[PDB]
């Protein structure tokens, strides 16, 4: 009931940024908020009803618009490597705050650094298979930048949570480069059935179709990139 | 200067224990006082709402206090559980007038009743020569090493439960040289 567009976006410095969050709730009070460690959530601006909004605490270089009860827009007519952040819409009814999902926002210098990962998923241990029944696959995403990832497990078509530990932060390798891991632990039984499809999955967020890409090499936008093993008896 | 503030800032703590965190602010007017609860990667949830000069709520493992007098509110987690892992923020006041503390930290970490500490490497098939390390089944007051060289990368813990837990870390290199022995100096390699 309360929807941010777009989750994931990058920009350039100078560039023009516009999140927006509609609501199903049909409450009169919506919010934007940024996140950053040792901050908190730091409201930029809100609305008390459609057709107007107010300056929160750090509303520097952004703007907001509350064009509908629904929704509430905020806009970075000049994007700064500052501005990179969380960002989180809320609505309210009576006090109580419904957040949205949350949009990771990268603002850089320029958008050649931008990067998909490479993606390795590795296979388990005959040790560990012997020693322990149970089978450890690990997976490995390197060389993306900025980090907007998401990495998931499917099992057989279906995606999987039991079992799986992934890290909760990206690793920075150098200073364009990040890296991510994940274990799937299953039994040895059913990583030894032939039947079995394990398969990690990245999905990168990166440019979309309006950004520019001056290259011979492939334009660095949104897609899903994996890796997959079958099962072996 | 910010108006709000917490503590633990950070904390560790073996889970089925209990924890406290506070806050204390300056903020007027704080006609209500908040507690939130952030996952990894989410959104936050709303754990409890303190409103009268001296209150006092509960809400199943969790109970909290407010005094308007010292601006003071702790939250109580009786026997945490691993899914507590998350931030706790304190949230002071209304609308656009509310402000968050930066938050408390909090991670809890599971009893291994028997670990079996083991370090295994593994191959990528996709790739020649391509491996990692994956030390695994070490108990949860163990010290997973920092990497002390160049091009060599090793992972936080990552705490696994297959619904027993396992803990967990990854290391992988570049270096033609070094192996999985030197890497993780526990033992099992
Ligand atoms: C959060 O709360 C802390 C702790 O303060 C206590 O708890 C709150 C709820 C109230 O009940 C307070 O009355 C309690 O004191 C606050 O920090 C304290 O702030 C006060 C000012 O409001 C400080 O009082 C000053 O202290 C000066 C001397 O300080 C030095 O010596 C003491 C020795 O005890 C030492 O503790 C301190 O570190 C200094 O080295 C004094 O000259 C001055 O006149 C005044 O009395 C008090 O020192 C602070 N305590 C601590 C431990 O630092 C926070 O300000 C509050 N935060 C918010 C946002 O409200
Ligand atoms: C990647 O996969 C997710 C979940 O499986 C899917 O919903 C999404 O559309 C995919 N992303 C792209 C850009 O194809």
């Known amino acids: 009931a309360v929807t941010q567009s777009p989750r994931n976006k990058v920009a350039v410095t100078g560039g023009k940024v516009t999140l927006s969050c509609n609501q199903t709730?049909?409450?009169?009070?919506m919010y934007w908020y940024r996140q950053d460690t040792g901050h908190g959530l730091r409201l930029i601006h809100y609305?008390?009803?459609?057709?107007?909004?107010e300056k929160g605490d750090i509303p520097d270089g952004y703007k907001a618009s509350r064009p509908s009860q629904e929704n509430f827009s905020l806009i970075l007519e000049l994007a700064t490597p500052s501005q990179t952040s969380v960002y989180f819409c809320?609505?309210?009814?009576?006090?109580?705050?419904?957040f949205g999902a949350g949009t990771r926002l990268s603002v850089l210098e320029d958008l050649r650094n931008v990067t998909p990962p490479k993606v390795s998923l590795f296979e388990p241990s005959k040790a560990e298979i012997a020693n322990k029944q149970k089978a450890t696959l690990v997976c490995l995403a390197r060389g993306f930048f900025p980090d907007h990832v998401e990495l998931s497990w499917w099992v057989n078509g279906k995606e999987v949570h039991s079992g799986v530990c992934t890290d909760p932060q990206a690793y920075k390798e150098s200073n364009y480069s990040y890296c991510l891991s994940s274990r799937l632990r299953v039994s040895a039984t059913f990583w030894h059935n032939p039947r079995n499809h394990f398969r990690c999955q990245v999905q990168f967020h990166g440019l979309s179709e309006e950004d520019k890409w001056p290259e011979g090499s492939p334009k660095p936008v949104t897609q899903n990139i994996s890796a997959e093993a079958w099962g072996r008896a | 200067k910010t108006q709000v503030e917490q503590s633990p800032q950070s904390l560790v703590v073996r889970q089925g224990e209990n924890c406290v965190l506070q806050?204390?602010?300056?903020?007027?007017?704080?006609?209500?006082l908040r507690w939130y609860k952030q996952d990894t990667g989410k959104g936050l949830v709303l754990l409890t709402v303190?409103?009268?000069?001296?209150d006092k709520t509960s809400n199943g493992r969790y109970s909290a206090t407010l005094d308007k007098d010292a601006k003071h509110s702790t939250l109580h987690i009786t026997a945490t559980l691993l899914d507590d892992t998350a931030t706790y923020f304190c949230?002071?006041?209304?609308?656009?007038?509310?402000?968050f503390g930066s938050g408390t930290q909090l991670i809890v970490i599971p009893y291994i009743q028997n670990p079996e500490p083991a370090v295994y490497q593994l191959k990528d098939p996709r790739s020649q020569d391509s491996t990692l390390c994956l030390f695994t089944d070490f108990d949860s007051q163990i010290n997973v090493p920092k990497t002390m060289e160049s091009g060599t990368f090793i992972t936080d813990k990552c705490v696994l439960d297959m619904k027993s837990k396992s803990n967990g870390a990854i290391a992988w290199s570049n270096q033609t040289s070094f192996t999985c022995q030197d890497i993780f100096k526990e033992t099992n390699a």
């Open positions: 949230v002071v006041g209304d609308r656009g007038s509310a402000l």
């Open positions: 609305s008390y009803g459609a057709g107007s909004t």
């Open positions: 709730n049909n409450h009169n009070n």
């Open positions: 806050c204390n602010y300056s903020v007027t007017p704080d006609n209500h």
């Open positions: 303190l409103v009268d000069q001296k």
């Open positions: 809320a609505s309210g009814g009576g006090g109580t705050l419904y």
